[PDB]
Design a protein around this ligand. Structure first.
Ligand SMILES: O=P(O)(O)OCCNS(=O)(=O)c1ccc(OC(F)(F)F)cc1
Ligand SMILES: O=P(O)(O)OCCNS(=O)(=O)c1ccc(OC(F)(F)F)cc1
Ligand SMILES: C=C(/N=C/c1c(COP(=O)(O)O)cnc(C)c1O)C(=O)O
Ligand SMILES: C=C(/N=C/c1c(COP(=O)(O)O)cnc(C)c1O)C(=O)O
Ligand SMILES: c1ccc2[nH]cnc2c1
Ligand SMILES: c1ccc2[nH]cnc2c1
Ligand SMILES: c1ccc2[nH]cnc2c1
Ligand SMILES: c1ccc2[nH]cnc2c1
Ligand SMILES: [Cs+]
Ligand SMILES: [Cs+]
Ligand SMILES: [Cs+]
Ligand SMILES: [Cs+]
Lengths: 395, 268, 395, 268
């Protein structure tokens, strides 16, 4: 039994070992209680405003849309304390951990932004934080490893599997199944077992709420579409949620196409995988014919995951949201373009979203469209990665 | 599921607990795995718990993680596992065989088709590690339709509702989890909580086997003394495989000695 | 002749080669004109809000003041787009450059934050940007070098002198004296020749204005003191300006003490130098007995300068502001403390300000005091520097 | 300032322009610098412009930057510069000597005291590079009180107010800047703007010397043809010092040839 629906159509559920079901039910119960607690909401709101810096700006691009009929705004989650949207829901989950009397935090991280958010919240709120990070990501997102450790978090390199995000997820969950009595698993995306996809959406939905109020103020109308990258689903569902019942507003999610979908080296299960059960949920995944989970690939550590959150699988199934893919090279071009023409250095994850919006504009330059891209993170963590690539390519 | 009923009836008649080793199918290779399993049986295993190699075994610690990896290195697939199971059943007509599965391997191309294949090769039970009773309906229904026992877990902090569900839904044997965490020999689980054992009996549950962290004969004896119908050991068995990869003969001799000692402890 | 007073008491002036005086007068004239232009102010305000993310948060420390009678707030300029307060006045000066019909920007940088701000503003507003940076700083602040170049700025290493900030200043000024017809010198601090100390204050004074409104809202009263580091003077005068006529509000500026004032390896001319003429101004400087300009030292590139802006020299002279120093080791301890107990990674520059506030608290823990520290920047640029130090010290 | 008046009266009588080399005092060492300056004079320099080594010479390009650095490497101080100036004046009683100063060296321990020291050793003019006319009052006042000519700059885009101020405030000679930028031989300045030359004469300014980027006899001739009273060359002279650091004798011979050629060009 649960208080809330663990499913979105066919997708979702609580596919965890039996040992973890009480922890999940306890978390669901604490969440439902906190959502109707005015004191919790005031604490959460105060942290978001005075500590994390909400509301974030909505920036109109001045240059990259020149000569077209596209108006493009960027929702500036890159300006959030920590440097990405991850910080939003971490503040809420940290408060839930305290509410449940836990003093320890487990977290997975890929881009290191959820790890940094987990570490900063744990430092602030007096929790002992340990973070699993794939060994490949420890290298390609190294600035965030330094930030996490300076804030007193234990960072544990994961060498098994692809040594990337899915492998960190695996270890975090194995850890929790033995430490749940004292540790809260601060899952970093809108995926995994219920109640996480629901909690993470509700603790990220200020992104879309603010965006709506800001676009109404500046343009007097709703966007034609909002566009966000999809690694697990949290920044996209945070942007989407408040627009779902606004039927005229397109919801576009962007999966990583890696080296090209045709190469098999990508992270786009929603459009190119098939339904499976893994990481506590029934969801689209990259898997072999036999049902082994495949290793994903993206230039961006934050998108490099072979599955996706169940609410996105559902929104896609009913046609409410559309999902597309963007390759490494397309994301890199969007990265460069934003740096050089708007003076913003975006996360490579966010650059996938931007890349698709630039494609929407370039493909149909006389189409009148008002677009918002969720700029989920800043790109400081990526500058060394991008620099090395551009150098090995002349430039 | 009948092979378990006959086993436990026989064991009860002899005032004996069961000893049930776990190994990964195809670890370290198909032929050696088949020989390993023959040695487990000849050494006195009352039943088998057998893992189908899975890419992401989230209920398993490093020892059995690495068993899965060795099997994959040998190119082991679920189809080859079912080939092995046919061979095992052909040699050993009465021993109960349980599979340790992860959900995606069962769900992959049809739950019903999976349990049908199990029935065809003569498997007796299936434990799906990442399907709690709350998500179990299509799995246990398919299992029962194909005369397969679906195995469910009774954790240390199981409440009464869970005990009643596990007793009603499960067949063959009830898995009595020694402790939280993942599989691992180094992490020793506690004694069988007597209240759970007696409550399961009160609710007419399938006989309880204790598992996780059981790696010594002393623990097997304690499990049976506490009222459990037997004990399962995995990582302790797999560590012997891992230790002797270069010495196939020494591997089997050490497996035989270990299993013999573990089984003897179940007679206590 | 000038429109505005180039002096603060004895300090300031326009000590530049005669060739540059028309450029300075032109800039002063454009500034006076822009300040009364409602269209300029609306453009500037729009950039500050919707592009840079103003107003910045005022954060109450929850943990580092425990067990004392100190209440400490942090003015969160670390949350500004770019990562430091530098971005504020760069947006205003960039608009002035456009107003004067210039298409090129020259800037010096030390910490690289003014360089990054100059580069991002130039990318946004369509200017060609070249940045001088001491070769020592190119190394110890390397993340900002990558950020500047990704945004299309030319970064020119300066190897002469101490290869730090003063040497970059020198080269920028030499450049401008030959290129002023097409290039605007976007000086990054409240120092140099008139009108820069005045312009930079006026384009940074939103820091103190916001701080005042925020502290009144949260505490119902003015701070007992506001505390800021002083490299050239801009973040401090930006914090101070709106409080200068609030006579009860202490103004405390923190100079870098380097390895210790007694070692001579510091950057504290206000309290330990003497009045001289250099970099276009009459101001306190570190100089030899003969009047050669000395090389300064600080662990922080942003504070490593042997002089200081004239308005601070003046405020000190009349006793309106007090100035103190903080050593490398004190700044490092404040850095660590903020990371581990508030989940904020501060710039090492800003850590000098924090260090002094922590000293005010620790020295007199039962003294009731309401303090604001200007957290002028985030510390991403410093994490490698700090990490290497902590490792070579066990830790 | 009288030594300049006598010089320009003599040059006017001979229908000649002035050639005035710049060098840094103490570059590359005190004794070699003294010999360098003797060679400049013997080769026909009409006057001298002499730099006191300063830590941060912001009106100077790399060539003269490096001259300052060499002097400092030899441990040259302003006190030693004044020792040199005494020696130079002792040998050469009539040649005008101008100092090229940066403000802090003059301001350091008293402006008045600085110009007093200048008068004592027999310096004739002081040009403070980073003091515009707008900031000049205490410097030109102290200069005039000690019979020192304060030298001011007329830039290419000087307006009428500036021309009148420079004409009124300055003595000895008026510095006619060839171009924007910093000192440098490679960056050739333009012809003397004739309107500035004639305007300075109209306002009874001290005679104009053109400087910055003057590095060839052709440029010296063009300066005098355009109406300037002479020309200053620094970096071109200093480059000969830099080029021949290892050959003191070749240095002086090359300096002599160069200066002779530059001076001859001023007779045109
Ligand atoms: O001796 P150990 O510690 O290696 O444990 C051996 C257990 N092997 S097994 O097949 O019974 C087994 C049983 C249940 C498992 O997960 C679940 F509890 F979540 F369902 C995993 C493995
Ligand atoms: O031949 P160059 O290009 O090396 O120029 C030599 C000039 N040497 S100098 O002493 O007359 C001289 C004159 C004025 C200077 O700066 C000022 F114009 F700002 F005042 C600097 C040097
Ligand atoms: C996996 C991580 N990051 C994901 C990420 C993502 C993708 O995750 P979501 O789909 O959950 O938003 C998007 N943008 C940024 C800046 C991100 O850092 C992590 O920081 O651990
Ligand atoms: C010199 C630089 N920085 C100075 C600096 C300072 C000191 O400069 P002001 O005194 O002008 O604020 C303080 N805080 C931060 C984050 C800074 O980056 C520069 O970024 O070029
Ligand atoms: C609301 C609450 C609980 C539920 N369980 C299944 N569907 C649900 C809807
Ligand atoms: C996919 C999977 C796990 C994640 N944790 C944080 N972001 C994620 C994306
Ligand atoms: C106001 C305006 C111009 C000035 N010049 C000198 N002092 C002044 C005050
Ligand atoms: C001192 C000097 C120059 C500067 N430019 C930016 N910050 C500075 C501090
Ligand atoms: Cs447009
Ligand atoms: Cs993905
Ligand atoms: Cs306090
Ligand atoms: Cs300083």
């Amino acid at each position: 039994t649960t208080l809330l629906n663990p499913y979105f159509g066919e997708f979702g559920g609580m596919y965890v070992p039996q040992i973890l079901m009480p922890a999940l039910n306890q978390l669901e119960e604490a969440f439902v209680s906190a959502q109707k607690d005015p004191e919790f909401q005031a604490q959460f709101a105060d942290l978001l405003k005075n500590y994390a810096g909400r509301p974030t700006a909505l920036t109109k691009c001045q240059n990259i849309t020149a000569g077209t009929r596209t108006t493009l705004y960027l929702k500036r989650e890159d300006l959030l304390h920590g440097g990405a949207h991850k910080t939003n829901q971490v503040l809420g989950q940290a408060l839930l951990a305290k509410r449940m009397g836990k003093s320890e935090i487990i977290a997975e991280t890929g881009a290191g932004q959820h790890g940094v958010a987990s570490a900063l919240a744990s430092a602030l709120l007096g929790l002992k934080c340990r973070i699993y990070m794939g060994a490949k990501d420890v290298e390609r997102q190294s600035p965030n490893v330094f930030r996490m450790r300076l804030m007193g978090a234990e960072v544990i390199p994961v060498h098994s599997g692809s040594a990337t995000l899915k492998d960190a997820c695996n270890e975090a969950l194995r850890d929790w199944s033995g430490s749940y009595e004292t540790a809260h698993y601060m899952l970093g995306t809108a995926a995994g077992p219920h109640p996480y996809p629901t909690i993470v959406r509700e603790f990220q939905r200020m992104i879309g709420e603010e965006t709506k109020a800001q676009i109404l103020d500046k343009e007097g109308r709703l966007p034609d579409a909002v566009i966000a990258c999809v690694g697990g689903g949290s920044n996209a569902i945070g942007m989407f949620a408040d627009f779902i019942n606004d039927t005229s507003v397109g919801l576009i999610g962007v999966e990583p196409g890696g080296h090209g979908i045709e190469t098999g080296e990508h992270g786009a299960p929603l459009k190119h995988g098939r339904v499976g059960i893994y990481f506590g949920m029934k969801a689209p995944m990259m898997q072999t014919a036999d049902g082994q989970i495949e290793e994903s690939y993206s230039i961006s550590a934050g998108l490099d995951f072979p599955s996706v959150g169940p609410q996105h699988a559902y929104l896609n199934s009913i046609g409410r949201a559309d999902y597309v893919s963007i390759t490494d090279d397309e994301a890199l071009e969007a990265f460069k373009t934003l740096c050089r023409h708007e003076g913003i250095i975006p996360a490579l994850e966010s650059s996938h979203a931007l890349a698709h919006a630039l494609k929407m504009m370039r493909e149909q330059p006389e189409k009148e469209q008002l677009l918002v891209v969720n700029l989920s993170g800043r790109g400081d963590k990526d500058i060394f990665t991008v620099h090395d690539i551009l150098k090995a390519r002349g430039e | 599921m009948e092979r378990y009923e006959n086993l436990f009836a026989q064991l009860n008649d002899r005032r004996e607990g069961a000893f049930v080793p776990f190994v990964t199918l195809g670890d370290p290779g198909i032929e050696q795995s088949l020989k390993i399993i023959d040695t487990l049986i000849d050494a006195g295993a009352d039943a088998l718990e057998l893992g189908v190699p899975f890419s992401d075994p989230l209920a398993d610690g490093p020892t059995i993680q690495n068993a899965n990896l060795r099997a994959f290195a040998a190119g082991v697939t679920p189809a080859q596992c079912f080939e092995m199971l046919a061979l095992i059943r052909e040699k050993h007509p009465t021993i109960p065989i349980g599979l340790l599965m992860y959900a995606n391997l069962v769900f992959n191309n049809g739950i019903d088709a999976f349990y049908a294949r199990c029935e065809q090769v003569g498997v007796d039970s299936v434990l799906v590690a990442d399907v709690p009773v709350e998500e179990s309906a299509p799995f246990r229904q398919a299992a029962l339709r194909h005369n397969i026992a679906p195995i469910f877990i009774c954790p240390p902090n199981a409440d009464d509702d869970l005990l009643r569900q596990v007793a009603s839904y499960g067949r063959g044997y009830t898995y009595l989890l020694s402790r939280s965490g993942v599989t691992g020999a180094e992490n020793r689980g506690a004694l069988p909580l007597h209240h759970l054992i007696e409550k399961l009996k009160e609710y007419h549950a399938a006989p309880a086997l204790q598992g996780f962290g059981i790696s010594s004969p002393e623990q097997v004896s304690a499990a049976v003394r506490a009222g459990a119908a037997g004990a399962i050991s995995g990582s302790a068995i797999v560590k012997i495989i891992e230790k002797n990869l270069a010495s196939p003969k020494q591997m089997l001799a050490e497996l035989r000695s270990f299993v013999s000692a573990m089984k003897a402890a179940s007679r206590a």
